[PDB]
Structure 1
Amino acid sequence: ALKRLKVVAAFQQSGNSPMGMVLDAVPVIPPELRPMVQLDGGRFATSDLNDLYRRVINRNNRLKRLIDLGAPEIIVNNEKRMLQESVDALFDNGRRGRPVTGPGNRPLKSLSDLLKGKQGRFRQNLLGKRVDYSGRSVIVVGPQLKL
């Protein structure tokens, strides 16, 4: 009861509702933050979020078309389960089951991966940055210099 009461009190005190746990719409990140750029030779470099968004869109369109067309409950539930699994991969790839893999059998970088670890947004970009008006070289001894 002590463990349970933490979340129940959290949802009780605030005006916010717990219904935000179950999603009915998904937001899409602006294109400039998931860019595809023209590499020479008619080759593009996707941002690896476009694949995860495309899977969600494909599954959602298929389920949407299978409902209006009429179908048994088995098939509709199967499509819903796969749609549920697609959004899980979009938000956190590999937290439940086998990670969705791209070319070369390498797991894709989900939204949660952009924030965690030494290579996340925080530590990599907010707390430490690359800067202008800088340089580096090898140091030697300067016995003739003043302090």
Structure 2
Amino acid sequence: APVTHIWYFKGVPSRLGYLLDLAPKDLEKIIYFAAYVITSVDDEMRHNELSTLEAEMAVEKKAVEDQRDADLEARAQKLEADLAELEAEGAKSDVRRKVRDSGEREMRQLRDRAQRELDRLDEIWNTFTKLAPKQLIVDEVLYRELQDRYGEYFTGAMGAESIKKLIENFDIDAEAESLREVIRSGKGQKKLRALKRLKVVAAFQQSGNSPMGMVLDAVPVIPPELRPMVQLDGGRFATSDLNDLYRRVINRNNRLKRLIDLGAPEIIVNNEKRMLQESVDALFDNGRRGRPV
């Protein structure tokens, strides 16, 4: 699994964060398997399909309205039937009022459910109509439901894979030109941001050295004799304590590989990926995210 080099993510100014324009908090949520970020989307055809998608939402909303009508008719009719079978008796006003109370509270619950469904459908429409690359979506339910069908129009993922993908598509020259234009065609106090970010961005434009190095597809291992271990009498062992981190990284990688061999559920795979990334990050640095094992 890809892993973002710790030096460039954590520790402000986050150079990866400055390059991507994403805030360090959202970048943390993305790297460490807590949120989904979108990537290349369909724009060649979906524009003609927007009307049909809206029509789908509208027809399902009309169906929701009919189902709401039936559900509330249930309460109304049962209230009327209870009052028909009760009020025929010379009963006290409590017999009349209890039915009203119960039926109307069920009425309120059903109405709440119907309105919530309508709002959820509106949210689906609104999130689709704005969906674009490098956008953030948090809820797993909404992201997965959008994928299952409408993802024929968009692709997305989480973890270091998403950052790798969106830096593959990063337009270094165009971003640098836009920042230069902003600082040149800019007079406000906010301009300093575009002034600072250029420093991080143009660093890769000026002499190359693509920012693909921000993410690692292979990690070097230092020569063994620089990290010795000393066995002792009495069953004690003295360690340089970095060999343990290397062992952990190797364990994480091997377990991840043998986990993906059988096609385990994607959530366990995500957990293992986060674990491997954290192990390699601890191998690289400690005390920044926190104290190590």
The structure that has the greater radius of gyration is 2
Q: Give the aligned residue type for 1:36.
A: M
Alignment of 1:1-147 (within 5 A): 1-96=194-289, 98-101=290-293
Please list the CA deviations of residues 81-128 of structure 1 after superposition, one character each: whole Å capped at 9, or x if unmatched.
Answer: 1111111111112311x4222xxxxxxxxxxxxxxxxxxxxxxxxxxx
TM-score, normalized by length of structure 1? 0.63
User: Does the 8 Å CA contact 1:11/1:18 hold for their aligned counterparts?
Assistant: yes
Q: Report the 3-state secondary structure (helix = DSSP H, G, I; strand = E; otherwise coil) of the residue aligned with 2:218.
A: strand
Which amino acid counterpart does residue 79 of structure 1 have in structure 2?
Answer: E
- Once the two structures are TM-superposed, the CA of residue 43 in structure 1 deviates from its matched residue by 3.3
The alignment covers a number of residue pairs equal to: 100
Q: What's the offset of the Cα at 1:9?
A: 1.1
Q: Larger strand proportion, structure 1 or 2?
A: 1
User: Which letter does structure 2 place at the counterpart of 1:3?
Assistant: K
Query: Structure 1: which 5+ runs fail to align?
Result: 102-147
Check conservation: 1:59, 1:82, Cα contact below 8 A: yes
**What code does the residue aligned with 1:99 have?**
R
Aligned equivalents of 1:62 and 1:56: distance in 2?
Answer: 10
For 1:50, give the aligned amino acid.
N
Residue type of the partner of 2:198?
Answer: L
User: 1 or 2 for the larger relative contact order (CA 8 Å, sep ≥6)?
Assistant: 2
Partners of 1:58 and 1:25 in 2: CA distance: 15
Whether the aligned pair in 2 keeps the contact of 1:89 and 1:99 (CA below 8 Å) is no
CA separation in 2, counterparts of 1:31 and 1:2?
45
Identity of aligned residues (%): 96
Give the 3-state SS of the residue equivalent to 1:16 in structure 2. coil
Shift of 1:37: 2.1
Do the aligned residues in 2 keep the contact of 1:34 with 1:49 (CA within 8 Å)? yes
Instruction: Report the secondary structure of 2:217's partner residue.
Output: strand
More helix by share: 2
Shift of 1:72: 1.3
